[PDB]
Amino acid sequence: ATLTAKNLAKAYKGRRVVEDVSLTVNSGEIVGLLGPNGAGKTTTFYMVVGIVPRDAGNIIIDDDDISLLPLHARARRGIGYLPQEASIFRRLSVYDNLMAVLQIRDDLSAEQREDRANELMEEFHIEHLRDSMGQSLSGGERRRVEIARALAANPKFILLDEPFAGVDPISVIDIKRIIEHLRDSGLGVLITDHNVRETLAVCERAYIVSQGHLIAHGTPTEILQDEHVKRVYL
Ligand SMILES: Nc1ncnc2c1ncn2[C@@H]1O[C@H](COP(=O)(O)OP(=O)(O)O)[C@@H](O)[C@H]1O
Ligand SMILES: [Mg+2]
Numbered sequence: 049a050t051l052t053a054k055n056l057a058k059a060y061k062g063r064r065v066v067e068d069v070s071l072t073v074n075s076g077e078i079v080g081l082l083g084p085n086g087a088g089k090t091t092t093f094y095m096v097v098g099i100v101p102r103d104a105g106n107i108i109i110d111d112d113d114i115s116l117l118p119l120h121a122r123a124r125r126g127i128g129y130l131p132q133e134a135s136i137f138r139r140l141s142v143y144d145n146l147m148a149v150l151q152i153r154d155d156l157s158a159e160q161r162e163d164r165a166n167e168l169m170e171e172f173h174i175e176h177l178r179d180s181m182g183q184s185l186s187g188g189e190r191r192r193v194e195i196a197r198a199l200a201a202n203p204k205f206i207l208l209d210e211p212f213a214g215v216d217p218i219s220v221i222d223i224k225r226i227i228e229h230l231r232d233s234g235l236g237v238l239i240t241d242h243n244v245r246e247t248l249a250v251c252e253r254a255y256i257v258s259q260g261h262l263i264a265h266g267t268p269t270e271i272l273q274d275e276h277v278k279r280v281y282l
Contacts, residue, residue, distance in 0.1 A: 053070060058088075065260050069092055082241055086259075142193055168196045192226065210241055253267050264276045
């Protein structure tokens with residue numbers, strides 16, 4: 049499957065934070081959207097997800113323009129989303145966190161939802177934390193729970209907004225592995241970070257954004273030799 053955003057633009061108080069941004073992610077690849085803080089990465093994700101209204105642009109899947117679909121209908125079309133800020137229910141156990149999102153799986157019985165919850169905990173290596181409250185988890189464990197939550201809906205595409213934010217150096221490795229596992233599973237993965245070199249390593253290719261503009265696209269090696277890129281990090 050192919051997910052495409054075309055000519056996205058968004059302004060707050062007239063200030064252009066995203067201008068003419070176009071990108072694509074396909075099933076079974078990891079695509080980066082990388083750039084400094086305030087560059088417009090989250091705003092772009094919001095427009096793809098349907099969280100904020102666009103001033104301009106189109107969101108499309110295959111031969112289907114879905115720009116007019118609300119967030120809930122876009123999710124049902126297979127777009128999943130991991131927010132930058134914490135999204136875990138802090139007072140709820142890891143298990144209750146998953147069961148809560150699995151309630152949207154109208155295709156499953158109540159007992160198949162529990163099966164799925166157990167499968168997800170095993171897949172994300174959090175099954176030993178079944179009854180731990182979200183509040184008591186490390187950043188790395190929290191993130192594994194939040195990513196599991198995002199997959200409960202069964203998306204074809206997952207937008208990961210700074211999945212490494214707030215996670216210790218060590219837990220970063222398992223998350224990277226899980227992301228690679230998602231891609232191998234056939235999901236299209238789109239991922240943001242301000243740490244270019246750290247996240248670049250996990251992408252097949254990446255768009256670089258600065259002050260609302262797309263300034264380059266390429267593989268990791270291409271990006272790291274790109275004059276327009278260097279020009280931003282002089
Ligand atoms: N509701 C809002 N009103 C005004 N400015 C905003 C609003 N939301 C975000 N911004 C600004 O837009 C810019 C881009 O934000 P964002 O997309 O979060 O960048 P990134 O995610 O790459 O750090 C930031 O400078 C931010 O302060
Ligand atoms: Mg952001």
